[PDB]
Amino acid sequence: SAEASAADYLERQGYRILARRFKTRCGEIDLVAQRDALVAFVEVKARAYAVTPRQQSRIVAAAEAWLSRHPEHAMSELRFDAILIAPNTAPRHLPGAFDATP
Amino acid sequence: SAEASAADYLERQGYRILARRFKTRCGEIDLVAQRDALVAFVEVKARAYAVTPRQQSRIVAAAEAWLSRHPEHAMSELRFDAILIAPNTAPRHLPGAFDATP
């Protein structure tokens, strides 16, 4: 329901959800969302903030698998996000929570 | 022979080679080397310098697989390195080429 909360939030903020709980052999992505020419790969976390090298490794590995199977996004802007879900407050969206830029 | 060059260099610099061309389902490590309580996971590259998010993802994934299967290093100091191999010069060792610290 943290994941449903996060997705509902992103939809209210103008995103389309492309995948939920996306699994591949080498990683996973809680949400894949799109707005305009931008694809966001989103980690949902129970609530500064810093993504673990392990999670980064796994989300990058999963993004790679996703992009390969969705040629329509081969040249889209990619962004790695977090959403923090805490008990008595709105989801907090951290766009670009880490940089996977070359 | 870039890999042999790198390993020979590290041995001259006091390291023991634990693995060469280490493969796992989700990544690979060109050299695993040890000195004292320190394990170095080393990417060998033909010659500042910056490891790609993809390679980082893969070397971290492979380090994780390695560490799990070598309990003796569960609590060792870990470092991620690069060695640059260029044509008319000694290997260049970049210890801690990236940070995988939590």
Q: What CATH number is given to the structural domain containing A23?
A: 3.40.1350.10
Residue B99 token pair: 């940070």
Per the structure, the complete domain to which residue A82 belongs is given by: 1-102
Q: Please, which residues have CB within 8 angstroms of residue B22's CB and are 6 or more apart in sequence?
A: B28, B29, B30, B32, B62, B66
The resolution in Å comes to 1.9
User: Nearest to residue B44, comparing CAs of B14, B22, B68, B69?
Assistant: B22
Polymer length in residues for chain A: 102
Judged by CB atoms within 8 Å, which residues 32-61 of A form the interface with B? Answer: 52-54, 56-58, 60-61
Instruction: Provide the CA A52 distance to its chain's centre, in angstroms.
Output: 14
Q: Which method was it determined by?
A: X-ray
Nearest chain B CA: its distance from A51 CA (Å): 8
* Among A84, A85, A95, A91, CA closest to A40: A95
Assigned token pair, B78: 């870990």
Distance from the Cα of residue A36 to its chain's centroid: 15
Contacts of A76 (CB under 8 A, 6+ apart): A34, A37, A38, A39
A92: part of which helix (H) or strand (E)? strand A92-98
Residue B95 φ/ψ region, left for φ over 0, alpha for ψ in the -120 to 50 degree band, beta for the rest: beta
CB contact under 8 A, B53 and A25: no
The whole-angstrom distance between B61's CA and the closest CA on chain A is 7
Task: Give the integer Cα–Cα distance in Å for A23 and A30.
Answer: 9
CA–CA separation, A48 and A95 (whole Å): 14
Strand partners, A77: A38
The reply to whether A13 touches chain B by the CB within 8 Å rule is: no
Size of chain B, expressed as the number of residues it contains: 102
Q: How far apart are CA B74 and CA B86, in angstroms?
A: 34
| CA-based nearest distance B66→chain A, Å | 14
How far is Cα B58 from Cα B64, in angstroms, rounded to an integer?
A: 10
Distance CA A32, CA A55 (A): 15
Q: Long-range contact list for A30-36, CB < 8 A, 24+ apart?
A: A30/A3, A30/A6, A31/A3, A31/A6, A31/A7, A31/A83, A32/A66, A33/A7, A34/A76
CB–CB contact B53 A100 (8 Å): yes
Taken in order B68, B69, B71, B72, is the CA torsion positive or negative? Answer: negative
Instruction: Give the C-alpha separation, B58 to A60, whole Å.
Output: 9
Name the domain count of chain B: 1
Q: How far is CA B39 from CA A2, A42, B1, B67, B77, in A?
A: 38, 32, 22, 10, 6
Pick A57's closest partner by Cβ from B52, B61, B102.
B61
Q: Please tell me which of the candidates B25, B58, B60 has its beta carbon nearest to residue A53.
A: B60
Residue A71 sits at the chain B interface (C-beta within 8 Å): no
Q: Which residues pair with B85 in a beta bridge?
A: B46
Q: Between B53, B60, B99, which is nearest A54 by CB?
A: B60
d(CA B67, CA B89): 33
The H or E element spanning position B6 is: helix B2-12
Rounded Cα gap, residues B18 and B20, in angstroms:
7
